[PDB]
Protein backbone atom coordinates (compact mmCIF):
# COMPACT_ATOMS: atom_id res chain seq x y z
CA UNK A 1 0.00 0.00 0.00
CA UNK A 2 1.36 3.41 -1.05
CA UNK A 3 0.70 6.53 1.02
CA UNK A 4 -1.31 4.70 3.69
CA UNK A 5 -0.66 4.41 7.37
CA UNK A 6 0.03 1.65 9.87
CA UNK A 7 -3.11 -0.29 10.77
CA UNK A 8 -4.39 -0.30 14.36
CA UNK A 9 -4.34 -3.50 16.28
CA UNK A 10 -7.40 -5.63 15.34
CA UNK A 11 -8.41 -3.02 12.75
CA UNK A 12 -8.74 -5.58 9.89
CA UNK A 13 -9.36 -8.99 11.58
CA UNK A 14 -10.45 -10.66 8.40
CA UNK A 15 -7.01 -9.83 6.82
CA UNK A 16 -5.20 -12.83 5.47
CA UNK A 17 -1.66 -13.21 4.21
CA UNK A 18 -1.01 -15.73 1.51
CA UNK A 19 2.45 -17.01 2.31
CA UNK A 20 4.65 -18.92 -0.09
CA UNK A 21 6.63 -21.83 1.33
CA UNK A 22 9.88 -22.76 -0.58
CA UNK A 23 10.81 -19.86 -0.69
CA UNK A 24 9.25 -18.07 2.22
CA UNK A 25 7.72 -14.84 0.90
CA UNK A 26 4.52 -12.79 0.64
CA UNK A 27 2.32 -14.13 -2.17
CA UNK A 28 -0.68 -11.93 -1.84
CA UNK A 29 -3.41 -10.69 0.31
CA UNK A 30 -6.73 -12.30 1.01
CA UNK A 31 -9.66 -12.23 3.42
CA UNK A 32 -11.49 -14.38 5.88
CA UNK A 33 -15.19 -14.83 5.11
CA UNK A 34 -16.10 -17.75 7.42
CA UNK A 35 -14.17 -20.19 9.71
CA UNK A 36 -13.12 -22.29 6.59
CA UNK A 37 -13.24 -20.08 3.55
CA UNK A 38 -10.75 -17.46 2.32
CA UNK A 39 -11.28 -15.12 -0.60
CA UNK A 40 -8.49 -13.76 -2.85
CA UNK A 41 -7.74 -12.64 -6.50
CA UNK A 42 -7.40 -15.52 -8.99
CA UNK A 43 -4.22 -14.00 -10.39
CA UNK A 44 -2.53 -14.50 -6.94
CA UNK A 45 -2.81 -18.25 -7.72
CA UNK A 46 -2.96 -18.53 -11.50
CA UNK A 47 -1.30 -16.10 -13.91
CA UNK A 48 0.46 -17.77 -16.91
CA UNK A 49 2.04 -14.62 -18.29
CA UNK A 50 4.17 -14.42 -15.07
CA UNK A 51 4.37 -18.19 -14.83
CA UNK A 52 2.31 -18.20 -11.62
CA UNK A 53 0.52 -21.46 -10.93
CA UNK A 54 0.32 -22.23 -7.26
CA UNK A 55 -1.24 -25.50 -6.06
CA UNK A 56 -2.62 -26.09 -2.50
CA UNK A 57 0.51 -27.43 -1.15
CA UNK A 58 2.59 -24.36 -2.29
CA UNK A 59 1.18 -21.91 0.24
CA UNK A 60 -0.03 -21.22 3.73
CA UNK A 61 -2.79 -18.94 5.03
CA UNK A 62 -1.70 -16.58 7.89
CA UNK A 63 -4.64 -15.03 9.77
CA UNK A 64 -4.54 -12.61 12.68
CA UNK A 65 -1.41 -10.87 11.54
CA UNK A 66 -0.06 -7.39 12.04
CA UNK A 67 3.70 -7.47 11.57
CA UNK A 68 4.64 -8.44 7.96
CA UNK A 69 7.68 -10.58 8.85
CA UNK A 70 7.51 -11.76 12.47
CA UNK A 71 5.89 -14.99 13.53
CA UNK A 72 3.23 -13.58 15.83
CA UNK A 73 3.17 -16.24 18.37
CA UNK A 74 -0.09 -16.62 20.32
CA UNK A 75 -1.80 -14.13 17.91
CA UNK A 76 -1.57 -15.37 14.39
CA UNK A 77 -2.94 -18.58 13.15
CA UNK A 78 -1.53 -20.53 10.27
CA UNK A 79 -3.77 -22.73 8.07
CA UNK A 80 -3.25 -25.23 5.37
CA UNK A 81 -5.23 -25.39 2.20
CA UNK A 82 -7.76 -28.10 1.29
CA UNK A 83 -8.70 -26.85 -2.05
CA UNK A 84 -8.47 -23.83 -4.45
CA UNK A 85 -11.40 -22.77 -6.63
CA UNK A 86 -10.74 -20.31 -9.42
CA UNK A 87 -13.67 -18.55 -11.24
CA UNK A 88 -14.23 -20.64 -14.48
CA UNK A 89 -14.53 -17.40 -16.55
CA UNK A 90 -11.54 -15.69 -15.02
CA UNK A 91 -9.99 -13.71 -17.90
CA UNK A 92 -6.26 -13.60 -17.37
CA UNK A 93 -5.57 -13.20 -21.05
CA UNK A 94 -7.12 -9.81 -21.50
CA UNK A 95 -8.09 -7.72 -18.50
CA UNK A 96 -8.33 -9.86 -15.29
CA UNK A 97 -12.08 -10.01 -15.58
CA UNK A 98 -13.52 -12.11 -12.74
CA UNK A 99 -10.28 -11.91 -10.79
CA UNK A 100 -11.56 -14.05 -7.97
CA UNK A 101 -10.67 -17.25 -6.12
CA UNK A 102 -11.75 -19.11 -3.05
CA UNK A 103 -9.67 -21.36 -0.82
CA UNK A 104 -11.08 -23.95 1.60
CA UNK A 105 -8.98 -24.48 4.74
CA UNK A 106 -8.20 -28.02 5.98
CA UNK A 107 -9.48 -27.16 9.54
CA UNK A 108 -11.70 -24.33 10.78
CA UNK A 109 -9.85 -21.39 12.31
CA UNK A 110 -10.87 -20.22 15.77
CA UNK A 111 -12.06 -16.62 16.00
CA UNK A 112 -10.33 -14.25 18.37
CA UNK A 113 -9.79 -10.58 18.94
CA UNK A 114 -7.46 -10.59 15.91
CA UNK A 115 -9.26 -13.11 13.69
CA UNK A 116 -12.84 -12.47 12.62
CA UNK A 117 -14.73 -12.71 9.28
CA UNK A 118 -15.92 -9.86 7.12
CA UNK A 119 -19.43 -9.73 5.54
CA UNK A 120 -20.18 -10.17 1.89
CA UNK A 121 -22.59 -7.65 0.39
CA UNK A 122 -26.03 -8.53 -0.85
CA UNK A 123 -27.61 -6.71 -3.75
CA UNK A 124 -28.97 -3.88 -1.55
CA UNK A 125 -25.66 -3.25 0.14
CA UNK A 126 -23.98 -2.92 -3.13
CA UNK A 127 -26.59 -0.55 -4.61
CA UNK A 128 -26.45 1.63 -1.45
CA UNK A 129 -22.67 1.79 -1.05
CA UNK A 130 -21.02 1.32 -4.44
CA UNK A 131 -21.35 4.87 -5.52
CA UNK A 132 -18.84 7.42 -6.94
CA UNK A 133 -17.37 9.38 -4.14
CA UNK A 134 -18.09 6.89 -1.37
CA UNK A 135 -14.84 5.68 0.26
CA UNK A 136 -13.74 2.24 1.14
CA UNK A 137 -10.69 0.93 2.76
CA UNK A 138 -7.77 -1.13 1.33
CA UNK A 139 -5.28 -3.02 3.55
CA UNK A 140 -2.19 -5.12 2.77
CA UNK A 141 1.55 -5.83 3.35
CA UNK A 142 2.49 -4.82 -0.13
CA UNK A 143 5.03 -2.45 -1.51
CA UNK A 144 5.24 1.07 -0.02
CA UNK A 145 6.17 2.39 -3.45
CA UNK A 146 6.13 1.37 -7.04
CA UNK A 147 9.92 1.08 -7.49
CA UNK A 148 10.29 -0.20 0.30
CA UNK A 149 8.25 -2.81 2.31
CA UNK A 150 6.35 -2.13 5.63
CA UNK A 151 7.02 -3.46 9.09
CA UNK A 152 3.26 -3.73 9.80
CA UNK A 153 -0.13 -4.01 7.88
CA UNK A 154 -0.88 -0.83 5.92
CA UNK A 155 -4.33 0.85 5.45
CA UNK A 156 -5.57 3.45 3.06
CA UNK A 157 -9.08 4.85 2.49
CA UNK A 158 -9.93 5.64 -1.15
CA UNK A 159 -13.01 6.96 -3.01
CA UNK A 160 -14.92 4.96 -5.59
CA UNK A 161 -14.47 6.69 -8.98
CA UNK A 162 -16.99 7.22 -11.76
CA UNK A 163 -17.02 4.36 -14.44
CA UNK A 164 -16.30 6.72 -17.37
CA UNK A 165 -13.27 8.14 -15.51
CA UNK A 166 -12.07 4.59 -14.70
CA UNK A 167 -12.44 3.61 -18.37
CA UNK A 168 -10.65 6.83 -19.67
CA UNK A 169 -7.65 6.14 -17.31
CA UNK A 170 -6.52 3.06 -19.29
CA UNK A 171 -6.43 1.30 -22.60
CA UNK A 172 -7.65 -1.96 -20.98
CA UNK A 173 -11.31 -2.92 -21.37
CA UNK A 174 -13.07 -2.34 -18.02
CA UNK A 175 -15.99 -4.66 -17.33
CA UNK A 176 -19.02 -4.47 -15.12
CA UNK A 177 -17.31 -7.06 -12.73
CA UNK A 178 -14.74 -4.31 -11.89
CA UNK A 179 -14.80 -0.96 -10.26
CA UNK A 180 -12.01 1.50 -9.67
CA UNK A 181 -11.02 3.71 -6.77
CA UNK A 182 -8.51 6.33 -5.91
CA UNK A 183 -8.06 10.13 -5.74
CA UNK A 184 -7.77 12.27 -8.84
CA UNK A 185 -4.90 14.55 -9.58
CA UNK A 186 -6.70 17.72 -8.53
CA UNK A 187 -7.84 16.16 -5.22
CA UNK A 188 -4.57 16.59 -3.30
CA UNK A 189 -4.64 13.27 -1.42
CA UNK A 190 -2.90 10.17 -2.56
CA UNK A 191 -2.88 6.43 -1.98
CA UNK A 192 -3.12 3.10 -3.78
CA UNK A 193 -2.46 -0.52 -3.49
CA UNK A 194 0.78 -2.00 -4.80
CA UNK A 195 2.72 -5.21 -5.52
CA UNK A 196 1.88 -7.74 -2.84
CA UNK A 197 -1.62 -6.19 -2.00
CA UNK A 198 -3.58 -8.11 -4.77
CA UNK A 199 -6.13 -10.43 -3.30
CA UNK A 200 -6.70 -8.30 -0.26
CA UNK A 201 -10.01 -6.62 0.62
CA UNK A 202 -11.60 -3.23 -0.30
CA UNK A 203 -14.12 -2.87 2.57
CA UNK A 204 -16.85 -0.38 3.44
CA UNK A 205 -18.65 0.11 6.75
CA UNK A 206 -22.38 0.08 6.29
CA UNK A 207 -23.97 3.14 7.94
CA UNK A 208 -27.27 1.13 8.09
CA UNK A 209 -26.10 -1.66 10.37
CA UNK A 210 -22.50 -0.73 11.26
CA UNK A 211 -20.96 -3.87 9.78
CA UNK A 212 -17.97 -4.06 7.50
CA UNK A 213 -18.66 -5.52 3.99
CA UNK A 214 -16.04 -6.58 1.53
CA UNK A 215 -17.19 -4.74 -1.65
CA UNK A 216 -13.95 -5.41 -3.65
CA UNK A 217 -10.88 -7.47 -4.16
CA UNK A 218 -7.61 -5.71 -4.86
CA UNK A 219 -6.90 -6.59 -8.53
CA UNK A 220 -4.53 -4.46 -10.62
CA UNK A 221 -3.29 -1.04 -11.45
CA UNK A 222 -0.86 0.53 -13.95
CA UNK A 223 1.94 1.07 -11.57
CA UNK A 224 1.11 2.24 -8.01
CA UNK A 225 -0.31 5.62 -6.97
CA UNK A 226 0.32 7.24 -10.35
CA UNK A 227 -1.36 10.49 -11.09
CA UNK A 228 -4.24 9.86 -13.46
CA UNK A 229 -4.35 6.08 -12.83
CA UNK A 230 -6.61 4.20 -10.38
CA UNK A 231 -6.83 0.79 -8.78
CA UNK A 232 -9.05 -1.85 -10.24
CA UNK A 233 -11.07 -4.03 -7.88
CA UNK A 234 -13.08 -7.12 -8.41
CA UNK A 235 -16.81 -6.38 -7.84
CA UNK A 236 -17.68 -8.90 -5.09
CA UNK A 237 -21.44 -8.56 -5.27
CA UNK A 238 -21.46 -9.20 -9.13
CA UNK A 239 -19.56 -12.52 -8.49
CA UNK A 240 -21.55 -13.57 -5.41
CA UNK A 241 -23.66 -16.25 -7.25
CA UNK A 242 -20.33 -17.98 -8.02
CA UNK A 243 -19.15 -17.62 -4.47
CA UNK A 244 -22.45 -18.98 -3.03
CA UNK A 245 -22.41 -21.88 -5.54
CA UNK A 246 -18.87 -22.86 -4.51
CA UNK A 247 -19.47 -22.72 -0.81
CA UNK A 248 -22.95 -24.47 -1.07
CA UNK A 249 -21.46 -27.26 -3.35
CA UNK A 250 -18.21 -27.85 -1.45
Amino acid sequence: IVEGSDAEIGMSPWQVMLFRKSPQELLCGASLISDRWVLTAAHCLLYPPWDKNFTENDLLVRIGKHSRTRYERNIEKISMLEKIYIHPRYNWRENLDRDIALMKLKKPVAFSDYIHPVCLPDRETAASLLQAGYKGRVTGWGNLKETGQPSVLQVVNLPIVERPVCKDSTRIRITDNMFCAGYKPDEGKRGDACEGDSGGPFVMKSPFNNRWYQMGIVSWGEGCDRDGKYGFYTHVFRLKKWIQKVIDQF
Binding site: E8, G10, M11, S112, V118, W212
Partner: peptide, 27 residues
Amino acid sequence: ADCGLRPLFEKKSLEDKTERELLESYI
Protein backbone atom coordinates in the same frame (compact mmCIF):
# COMPACT_ATOMS: atom_id res chain seq x y z
CA ALA B 1 -24.26 -13.89 12.09
CA ASP B 2 -21.49 -11.79 13.66
CA CYS B 3 -19.72 -10.97 10.31
CA GLY B 4 -18.11 -7.54 9.94
CA LEU B 5 -18.23 -6.64 13.68
CA ARG B 6 -14.62 -6.34 14.95
CA PRO B 7 -13.92 -7.60 18.44
CA LEU B 8 -11.64 -4.61 19.32
CA PHE B 9 -13.92 -1.99 17.65
CA GLU B 10 -17.67 -2.49 17.02
CA LYS B 11 -17.97 -5.29 19.67
CA LYS B 12 -16.68 -2.77 22.30
CA SER B 13 -18.19 0.35 20.70
CA LEU B 14 -14.71 1.75 20.02
CA GLU B 15 -14.05 3.58 16.73
CA ASP B 16 -10.80 3.38 14.72
CA LYS B 17 -8.96 6.51 13.82
CA THR B 18 -10.27 6.96 10.19
CA GLU B 19 -13.60 5.10 9.87
CA ARG B 20 -15.37 8.44 10.26
CA GLU B 21 -13.74 9.46 6.96
CA LEU B 22 -15.66 6.63 5.30
CA LEU B 23 -18.92 7.56 7.00
CA GLU B 24 -18.59 11.22 5.97
CA SER B 25 -18.20 10.20 2.34
CA TYR B 26 -21.59 8.30 2.43
CA ILE B 27 -23.48 11.47 1.55
